[PDB]
């Protein structure tokens, strides 16, 4: 059964999400304007979008129970390697399967696969990304499970460069046992059938999506003209 500490963890994560995710999308007015038609016209606007959510992801991570017990180096390693994946996860909230688009409140801020293309990325990434968004939406996660999966994603002990992998695993285990126990006691069948295994699979899907984005980002960011439209935070987290 769900221990008092486990429902505390869920409460903390639910609150952290509501403080770091804004469903009004009111800050999108501050980004560079979206340009939709050859040129990578969506790169300025999407760079600002990504940079904004990296900030939100950092804010969420800082509130995960136990995260701040890690060294600053480990917190950096965990966030640099996971931010792209948490963005993919948290973007599923705005994703809609009616037209396979990320609807963030307005047509200007409604993104489809054409907009991903107009940021330099190819179907090598977009195709498995949409399949991921579809499959994640299929799980119909409770918000409790949604925030738990984002937090498990962040505190992963196998990320490259992690120093105190013992502590990272112990933190992730408390989150993992919290999620498993939550599914048993609060997710009724048949929705809970193999749910934990399917959620862990999505973490594996994310590692592959991470790999492909990182390789396309490295190719895109190698061109200095493209690097110019990125933000300093994006360049710091995703790489030079």
């Amino acid at each position: 059964k769900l221990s008092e500490e486990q429902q505390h963890i869920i409460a903390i994560l639910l609150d952290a999400h509501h403080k770091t995710y804004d469903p009004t999308y009111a800050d999108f007015r501050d980004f560079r304007p979206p340009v939709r038609m050859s040129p990578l016209s969506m790169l300025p606007h999407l760079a600002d979008l990504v940079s904004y959510s990296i900030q939100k992801v950092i804010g969420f991570a800082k509130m995960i129970p136990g995260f701040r017990d890690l060294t600053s180096d480990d917190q950096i390693v965990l966030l640099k390697s996971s931010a792209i994946e948490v963005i993919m996860l948290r973007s599923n909230q705005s994703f809609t399967m009616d037209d396979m688009s990320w609807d963030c409140g307005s047509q200007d801020y409604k993104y489809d696969v054409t907009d991903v293309s107009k940021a330099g990325h190819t179907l090598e990434l977009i195709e498995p990304l949409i399949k991921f968004q579809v499959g994640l939406k299929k799980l119909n996660l409770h918000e409790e499970e949604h925030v738990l999966l984002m937090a498990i994603c962040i505190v992963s002990p196998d990320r490259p460069g992690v120093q105190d992998a013992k502590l990272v695993e112990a933190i992730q285990d408390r989150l993992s046992n919290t999620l498993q126990t939550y599914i048993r006691c609060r997710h009724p069948p048949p929705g809970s059938h193999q749910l934990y295994a399917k959620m862990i699979q999505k973490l594996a899907d994310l590692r592959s999506l991470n790999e492909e984005h990182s390789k396309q980002y490295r190719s895109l960011s190698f061109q200095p003209e493209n690097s110019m439209k990125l933000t300093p935070l994006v360049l710091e987290v995703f790489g030079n």
């Binding site: 900030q55 950092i58 800082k62 600053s72 710091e236 987290v237």
Partner: peptide, 11 residues
């Protein structure tokens, strides 16, 4: 060190 804006956002 090398991630000053990440470190600053981590307080």
């Amino acid at each position: 060190k090398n991630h000053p804006m990440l470190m600053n956002l981590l307080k």
